[PDB]
A paper describes a structure:
O-Demethylases belong to the class of cobalamin-dependent methyltransferases that catalyse methyl-group transfer from a methyl donor to a methyl acceptor via a methyl­cobalamin or methylcobamide acting as a reaction intermediate. In the case of the O-demethylase system, four different proteins are needed for the reaction: (i) a substrate-binding domain that serves as a methyl donor, (ii) a cobalamin-binding domain that catalyses the methyl-transfer reaction, (iii) a tetrahydrofolate-binding domain that accepts the methyl group, thus forming 5-methyltetrahydrofolate, and (iv) an activating enzyme that reduces the cobalt of cobalamin back to the catalytically active +1 state in case of occasional oxidation to the inactive +2 state. Bioinformatic studies propose that CobDH is part of a multi-component O-demethylase enzyme system.
CobDH was crystallized in the presence of methylcobalamin and the structure was refined to 1.5 Å resolution. Two CobDH monomers were found in the asymmetric unit. The overall high-resolution structure of CobDH reveals two domains that are separated by a flexible linker. The N-terminal domain (residues 1–82) folds into an antiparallel four-helix bundle. The C-terminal domain (residues 90–212) resembles a typical Rossmann fold with a central five-stranded parallel β-sheet surrounded by six α-helices that forms the binding site for the methylcobalamin. The corrin ring and the central Co atom are presented on the surface of the protein, while the dimethylbenzimidazole (DMB) base protrudes deep into the central β-sheet region. His102 forms a coordination bond towards the Co atom from the lower axial site, which results in a base-off/His-on cobalamin-binding form. No electron density has been observed at the upper axial ligand site from the Co atom. This finding leads to the conclusion that the methyl group in the crystals has been cleaved off by photoreduction during crystallization, cryoprotection or X-ray exposure, a process that has also been described for other crystal structures of methylcobalamin-dependent enzymes, resulting in the formation of cob(II)alamin. No electron density was observed corresponding to the long linker region which connects the two domains (residues 83–89), suggesting a high degree of flexibility within the linker.
Author numbering: 1 to 81, 88 to 211
The structure:
């Protein structure tokens, strides 16, 4: 670009004018390597959206916005240019998916292939999907205590099938924290969907 750090800031600020000004400049010079640098800068800015949510400056709506804004930039940058895979579910006992879907949108916009299994998803169905597609990451959503139990059951089933050690497990949902992460047997838990993407990007290469 002219200025990658300013472009990261523009994503952080959710400034559609500035984001599209730079996307246009990059698309004009038709350099794949420059487009990839801009993408990385936008991804860094997504992380900053999460930090701004965690501070209380930004709200749920801003997280919805961020995902949609990143995806729109990615769609424009695609002409100028093997995805890591995530199997994603709201687990058995739970019908809450607003949050999971915020994450799904951010993860899709960040170049992951996401297999969204939907809500109230039985353990056995999650495990069958992991056998089928061999994802790098399994992401599990829930809030009710029964759901948190189903998270633990899903990890235990992956261990029984010899699948656990070759993937990473991330959990999210209203009540998740380090204590729930430990009880479940997950690798990490998210504070917010943008933090979760940050985690997942670190795991993949």
């Amino acid at each position: 670009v002219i200025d990658l750090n300013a472009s990261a800031q523009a994503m952080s600020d959710l400034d559609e004018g500035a984001i599209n000004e730079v996307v246009d400049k990059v698309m004009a010079k038709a350099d794949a390597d420059a487009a990839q640098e801009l993408i990385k800068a936008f991804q860094q800015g997504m992380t900053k959206v999460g930090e701004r949510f965690d501070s209380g400056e930004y709200f749920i709506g801003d997280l919805i916005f961020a995902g949609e804004i990143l995806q729109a930039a990615m769609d424009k940058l695609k002409p100028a240019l093997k995805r890591a895979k995530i199997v994603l579910a709201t687990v058995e006992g739970d019908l809450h998916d607003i949050g999971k879907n915020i994450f799904r949108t951010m993860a899709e916009a960040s170049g992951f292939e996401v297999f969204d299994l939907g809500i109230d998803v039985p353990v056995k169905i999650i495990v069958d999907k992991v056998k089928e597609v061999n994802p790098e990451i399994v992401g599990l959503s829930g809030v009710l205590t029964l759901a948190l139990d189903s998270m633990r059951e899903t990890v235990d089933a992956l261990k029984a099938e010899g699948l656990r050690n070759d993937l990473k497990v991330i959990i999210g949902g209203v009540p998740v924290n380090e204590n729930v992460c430990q009880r479940v047997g997950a690798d990490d838990f998210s504070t917010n969907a943008a933090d979760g993407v940050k985690i997942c990007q670190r795991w993949v290469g």
